[PDB]
Design a binder for these strands. Structure first.
Ligand code: CMP
Ligand code: CMP
Lengths: 197, 199
DNA sequence: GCGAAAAATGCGAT
DNA sequence: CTAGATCGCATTTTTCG
DNA sequence: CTAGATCGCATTTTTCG
DNA sequence: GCGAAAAATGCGAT
């Protein structure tokens, strides 16, 4: 619709399965717009480990956190999860775009409000829950949002235990030791591809 | 300027220290703008624990995360830390003050801008750092906000060991038990209040 | 600027 | 193995009439 | 106490030409 | 739409 004026005012780039869409700490002067696919958002800790703050997808503005005050630079890594096509465009341009139309400012603004929410619940989650109850939370959230292939008795996921650990905050060998517990209990199913029965 | 206009249509109220401005859960439909004083945004889980996602001062907007979708709930309690002056409009109303002047829709979104970058880091200090690290990062965090009186060396923050905990996630005990030595380490000294960078 | 009362802290071996 | 979490109510420490 | 973390490497599983 | 190659897993006494 309105978001139609934008799409054809930006570019279409190509990034394969693993390219790092944007890197931490590098003066933000352009916002991406995932056309097809899904990137993942991550910050890391001195010793090297990563944590997956979020999983953006098909139609989510990216790297916006700075279109509002020059002098800023990245705050997280974004590496394409699948095959992603990103709609590139500078901040200034995009800016003079808003003066033409307002509506388009009223879109991501939301996007960045829905995240401010979720993330609060991640702190709500990381501090009010022990790893078990957190893996349960994270499986549901992945049984939700797209890509979760339907299955006979529920939704199906495709994620590595090593990976769960990152969204959550625990170690490789607990995520998987928990999944077995859940497995045994009959809450889900497991095999490199888990089903959240 | 582009705000006196914004306050033009904006019933304004004076809330007293410690008053609940907003309930986490309640149906959301009104915006707010703090023209004086300051609040604190906090979440709390059923067994009774609480957390401080942040403190909000003058110029800050509050309860604006339901402003984009019809039918959200207020995502967290907000309680005046002092006596505030708060202006309100009403969602439906705001949306109109936008079409006619989309600028007032900017300032706000550049706020959340930051708020997201910030609350984001909360998540990262929490899963990455130890209670200590998170106190060291908390002391400085506060040591530089609208209320840090200048001490000959560094400055004088004013806080209780329990606020810290709420901001950190650990206990009333472990905080001090963890503050004593951080003091013996000789970077700061406490006693009812604390001074950052030697005292 | 003095109190009584309301709050905020400290203990530690599990 | 290690970081923190805890509980009953005695104390400093703070608030404001 | 009690929830979680580690490490070196045989197996398994999943990925990529 | 096979297979070597490259990643993810499972173990526990501490
Ligand atoms: N908590 C979050 N939830 C979702 N997306 C985020 C979050 N934090 C950062 N990002 C995204 O990651 C991007 C990294 O670059 P920017 O800081 O430009 O903008 C950031 C956002 O688009
Ligand atoms: N993570 C956060 N950081 C700062 N403020 C927040 C956060 N989460 C919620 N809030 C604020 O608290 C308000 C609670 O109600 P709303 O969701 O309407 O709007 C929310 C924001 O104004």
């Amino acid at each position: 619709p309105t978001l139609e004026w934008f799409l054809s005012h930006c570019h279409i780039h190509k990034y394969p399965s693993k390219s790092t869409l944007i890197h931490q700490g590098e003066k933000a002067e352009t916002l991406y717009y995932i056309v097809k696919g899904s990137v993942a958002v991550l910050i890391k800790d001195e010793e090297g480990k990563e944590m997956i703050l979020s999983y953006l997808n098909q139609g989510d503005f990216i790297g916006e956190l700075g279109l509002f005050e020059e002098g800023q630079e990245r705050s997280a890594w974004v590496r394409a999860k699948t095959a992603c096509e990103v709609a590139e465009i500078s901040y200034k341009k995009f800016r003079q775009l808003i003066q033409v139309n307002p509506d388009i400012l009223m879109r991501l603004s939301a996007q960045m409000a829905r995240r401010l929410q979720v993330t609060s619940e991640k702190v709500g989650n990381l501090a009010f829950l022990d790893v078990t109850g957190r893996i349960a939370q994270t499986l549901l959230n992945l049984a939700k949002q797209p890509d979760a292939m339907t299955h006979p008795d529920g939704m199906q996921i495709k994620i590595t235990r090593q990976e769960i650990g990152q969204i959550v905050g625990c170690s490789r060998e607990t995520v998987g030791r928990i999944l077995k517990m859940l497995e045994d209990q009959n809450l889900i199913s497991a095999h490199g591809k888990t089903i959240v029965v």
